[PDB]
Amino acid sequence: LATLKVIGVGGGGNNAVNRMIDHGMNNVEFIAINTDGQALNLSKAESKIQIGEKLTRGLGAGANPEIGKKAAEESREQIEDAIQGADMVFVTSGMGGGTGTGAAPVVAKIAKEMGALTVGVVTRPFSFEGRKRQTQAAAGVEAMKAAVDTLIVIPNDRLLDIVDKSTPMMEAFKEADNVLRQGVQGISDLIAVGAGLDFADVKTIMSNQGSALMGIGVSSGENRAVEAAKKAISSPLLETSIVGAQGVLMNITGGESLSLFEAQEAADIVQDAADEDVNMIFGTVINPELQDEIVVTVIATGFD
Numbered sequence: 001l002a003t004l005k006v007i008g009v010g011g012g013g014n015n016a017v018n019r020m021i022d023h024g025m026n027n028v029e030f031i032a033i034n035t036d037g038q039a040l041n042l043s044k045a046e047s048k049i050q051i052g053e054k055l056t057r058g059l060g061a062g063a064n065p066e067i068g069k070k071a072a073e074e075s076r077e078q079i080e081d082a083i084q085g086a087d088m089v090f091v092t093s094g095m096g097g098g099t100g101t102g103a104a105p106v107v108a109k110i111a112k113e114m115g116a117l118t119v120g121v122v123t124r125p126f127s128f129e130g131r132k133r134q135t136q137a138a139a140g141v142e143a144m145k146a147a148v149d150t151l152i153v154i155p156n157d158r159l160l161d162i163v164d165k166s167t168p169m170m171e172a173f174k175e176a177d178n179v180l181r182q183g184v185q186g187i188s189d190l191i192a193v194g195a196g197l198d199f200a201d202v203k204t205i206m207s208n209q210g211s212a213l214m215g216i217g218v219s220s221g222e223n224r225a226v227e228a229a230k231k232a233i234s235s236p237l238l239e240t241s242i243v244g245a246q247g248v249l250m251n252i253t254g255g256e257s258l259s260l261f262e263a264q265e266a267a268d269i270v271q272d273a274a275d276e277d278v279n280m281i282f283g284t285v286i287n288p289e290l291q292d293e294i295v296v297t298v299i300a301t302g303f304d
């Protein structure tokens with residue numbers, strides 16, 4: 001086994017967790033974290049932790065990371081016992097808020113302290129949200145880098161091209177929750193069901209690496225594997241030059257038709273796009289609910 005815990009920190013972070021529940025992830029345990037008592041109620045997670053009750057009285061962090069920072073420090077023990085037993089902890093949050101920007105780095109440090117492989121999956125706010133949010137988020141990012149083994153950062157502006165253009169600003173973060181689900185699912189599924197690798201290989205590629213890029217490719221057809229890999233390494237989601245990688249993790253999820261030769265033909269594509277001296281590790285995830293559709297996920301770490 002491997003105990004995989006996903007911890008949502010903040011408003012958007014918890015919205016992502018709900019989205020993961022409704023999507024039907026099962027290899028993972030979900031924790032909700034917020035200084036907002038009301039929004040925490042709306043968490044579909046099995047475990048909810050109110051933080052900083054004596055400091056904020058359950059009313060939200062008012063968009064100041066500093067408040068979120070001590071709120072988590074004040075409730076360290078409750079965080080500590082939630083993270084308990086986890087071989088690996090995902091911290092997912094939106095950067096630029098209060099509870100998220102401030103507390104998530106704390107949640108990450110505690111988890112990494114306890115000896116869990118700690119991966120952060122976060123977003124940069126939209127550009128239109130303003131300079132304050134931007135700066136607050138940049139500080140939020142950097143804080144996380146020092147608190148996690150591996151940080152995945154997804155700018156919301158990079159999703160703006162795949163937003164409908166017929167979308168209210170209320171629904172504007174439904175693509176962020178989606179990618180956050182994919183970010184977590186792509187890795188977690190590799191550990192649980194994946195063949196061809198195992199948890200110890202993932203710890204090697206991911207411990208103390210720093211920033212990581214993620215790319216996803218979906219395809220079906222005669223040479224579906226190659227096309228799916230080709231989409232993943234040319235995905236919009238990353239600043240494209242994965243070539244800087246000193247580590248690559250690959251998830252090829254498919255149906256029962258998915259063969260080894262197909263996997264390899266897709267693994268070769270990714271390897272040719274990265275440094276020749278890259279430590280590549282990849283695995284096969286079987287989802288029988290798929291017939292011909294294949295999903296390739298690459299996480300490039302170790303840079304730089």
Ligand SMILES: Nc1nc2c(ncn2[C@@H]2O[C@H](COP(=O)(O)OP(=O)(O)O)[C@@H](O)[C@H]2O)c(=O)[nH]1
Pocket residue numbers: 009010011012013015016034061062063093094095096097098099100101123124125126129133156173174176177180
């Ligand atoms: N994934 C996701 N991100 C969000 C959502 N709402 C807001 N965000 C992003 O997260 C940032 C604010 O985080 P939020 O959770 O709302 O604030 P906090 O609870 O005080 O930490 C904003 O700048 C948004 O870019 C959401 O529902 N889902």
